[PDB]
Design a protein around this ligand. Structure first.
Ligand SMILES: *Cc1cccc(C*)c1
Ligand SMILES: *Cc1cccc(C*)c1
Lengths: 254, 9, 253, 248, 8
């Protein structure tokens, strides 16, 4: 008896557009705390941790722990029919094999009613210890999006080098070389337009750009992205879901 | 290389 | 004949409406107006365009001329039209070519195109019928609903009653049910939903042809749907200060 | 060492987008006078002549003649990574790579790219019969418009107007611009010495059209049996000149 | 389904 009413469905819309392309099949663990997704990709290179919390929904009601097998492509298609101001209602029965989506317009005159198939879950949900990282950059999401797009033309790999004074992105492909460098902002009149670095040990890591573009697709959710990297451990691309959850992407270095 | 993935967790 | 029109955007929109669904049609020109009435390729749908004499800025016709036009070439030529260029459609008493003339008011540019006409137009009759259910909604909302439900399946199920219309699809990735309700406001040209129910209707239609009909959305702010059992669906658009487009499609049965 | 500092990178971006589709690999001749390109298209049909001069650049410094083999698509991508609002081209006396440095006026973001070169492997003469001076935008329209009617264009220059004509299997089209002038300015002006009636192929003029955002005015230069010259001037920095051989 | 020549 899962029933979640949320009024700004844009968020739920955006999340789908974020995760539609990276993960094909996912498993939503529904509990009395919130909706939690944690999955990998085909070749086990990246990891996605989505967490939306009970206090964010306008009406959360859960009875038993539900394990739903979702096809995020079909689901993204169904929420494509969702208005950005539409109110979305997730619903399911304690044992049902179908998830019900209800899109309802602010002016109570249109009620779209969709029902998606669930499938057999078979996911190994490993744990990722929330840890303390050597380098932690906190920048606007738009410029990170820029840099990833720009450097995606040069090569298939990026080299992030965090130091004491600046963050540096570097690519080197079959058609040349590229080096973008962002620096520390002082006192800018916008909290979400500032770059700040918290260094404890300079880091020198090599990642793949395709998955960074995948992660970049989640840009409209937050104005600020946080990168967290350290030697030999994965990079954490984190977007805040304003007053409700978090989205976390992880990548294993070269 | 490509580390894949856990390998790390 | 000779038809002078100042706001060519309208005619551009009409062509963009019918350019893709119907390829070649027949234009019956008379002293009353331009009349098009055609079918599609797979003989499923029907288009009825009517532009009236009073809408043109200078309309002059003498006798009924029946010219066979290929709306794709004409649509390209109307893509070549200037937005401020006063447009003159023209034709010779017996010539096999239709002339389009775009002329700038003050400037010095005159585009002059001449398209070849043709001659085969099996025009069936439309009894002036009374339909069981008649909904009048904004064209944008019909466009939305068709687009949205086009992702689920190839068919739509319209169920009209006294207070609300219901759209239903069932495809390879689920099912969908949209429902529109009545108006409660004092000013809602293209904001209100109204139903003219005499007997609730339950009809099954194809979504591809509805999207083809939908492409004509920027023409009018209001669409009128007309349904009855076993008879085709009537999707009607107003052409502001001229005529009308009426699309007919045969149900699934 | 070559070093060119430029403030309006919009120009260079526009140029790259212009010739990106016509030429695949090119020869950039950089000297102390300016950057000069002269190449043909696929199967060596039509000709492109780019000339940017040192006096246009904000900081020009050249030492030796540089002949760089560029893949204009890669350069177009790198200048797509360029903000429209400071661009630095650079190269070494013997280096096999061209360096692009994008820097914001306010010290915030500094992109540094270095592109690999490739391996390199006639003179441009005339007095023309008809010489038209029109806006580039209307040339763009008319070329596209008549490209919808047919694949070939017929330019007919006379004493009062230029005329464009196409003729395909579904009709014909004829646009005509005329020589209106007042005391109030004039918009289209022609320097005619003998009326011209010439037939060209529309695909290459549509190629030439991509250079429209460079200048607001294009100059057409035509004469019988000799190529058509489509010329756009760059704000005293240089010019782009396209040459196309007429039909028989 | 129904063709549109059934009708009219
Ligand atoms: C870094 C690395 C090399 C080979 C295999 C794995 C999982 C990781
Ligand atoms: C041909 C035909 C007969 C009866 C009903 C329909 C919809 C079509």
């Amino acid at each position: 008896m899962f029933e979640a009413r949320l009024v700004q469905g844009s968020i739920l819309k955006k999340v789908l557009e974020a995760l539609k392309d990276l993960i094909n099949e996912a498993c939503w663990d529904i509990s009395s705390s919130g909706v939690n997704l944690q999955s990998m990709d085909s070749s086990h290179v990246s990891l996605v941790q989505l967490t939306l919390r009970s206090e964010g929904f306008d009406t959360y009601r859960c009875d038993r722990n539900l394990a739903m097998g979702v096809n995020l492509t079909s689901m993204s298609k169904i929420l494509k029919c969702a208005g950005n101001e539409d109110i979305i209602t997730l619903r399911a029965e304690d044992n049902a094999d179908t998830l019900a989506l209800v899109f309802e317009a602010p002016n109570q005159e249109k009620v779209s009613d969709y029902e998606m198939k669930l499938m057999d879950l078979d996911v190994e949900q490993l744990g990722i210890p929330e840890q303390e990282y050597s380098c932690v950059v906190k920048m606007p999401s738009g410029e990170f999006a820029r840099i990833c797009r720009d450097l995606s033309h040069i090569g298939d790999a990026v080299v992030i080098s965090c130091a004491k004074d600046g963050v540096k992105f570097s690519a080197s492909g079959e058609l040349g070389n590229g080096n973008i460098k962002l620096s520390q902002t002082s006192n800018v009149d916008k909290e979400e337009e500032a770059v700040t670095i918290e260094m404890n040990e300079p880091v020198q890591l090599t990642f793949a750009l395709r998955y960074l573009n995948f992660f970049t697709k989640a840009t409209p959710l937050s104005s600020t992205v946080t990168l967290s990297m350290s030697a030999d451990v994965p990079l954490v691309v984190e977007y805040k879901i304003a007053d409700m959850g978090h989205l976390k992407y992880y990548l294993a270095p070269k | 290389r490509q580390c894949s993935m856990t390998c790390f967790y």
